[PDB]
Amino acid sequence: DAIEEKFRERLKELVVPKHVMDVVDEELSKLGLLDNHSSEFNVTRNYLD
């Protein structure tokens, strides 16, 4: 959650659209469901950044 929360305070400053809000948040939910080791998770991690 460290990456997620530095990006979350990021998110807290800039006023994201609610569409993009739910997208970043559900992508964050998929980060949480995706295992850390997967290269698929590395792709979504790079995507989140």
Partner: protein, 48 residues
């Protein structure tokens, strides 16, 4: 996608169905004229 590929998520239609919560919405396909008919798999067959 098949759900066997890594990261697969359901096609757009299921998402609209998930959102509108009705069995009988009013889908509005847009801009049929410019659908991409390429070597990479023609969607226009998929629309039929």
């Amino acid at each position: 996608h098949r759900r066997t590929y890594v990261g697969a998520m359901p096609g757009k239609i299921i998402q609209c169905l998930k959102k509108t919560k009705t069995e009988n919405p009013l889908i509005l396909i847009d801009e049929v004229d410019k659908i991409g008919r390429g070597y990479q798999g023609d969607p226009s067959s998929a629309l039929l």
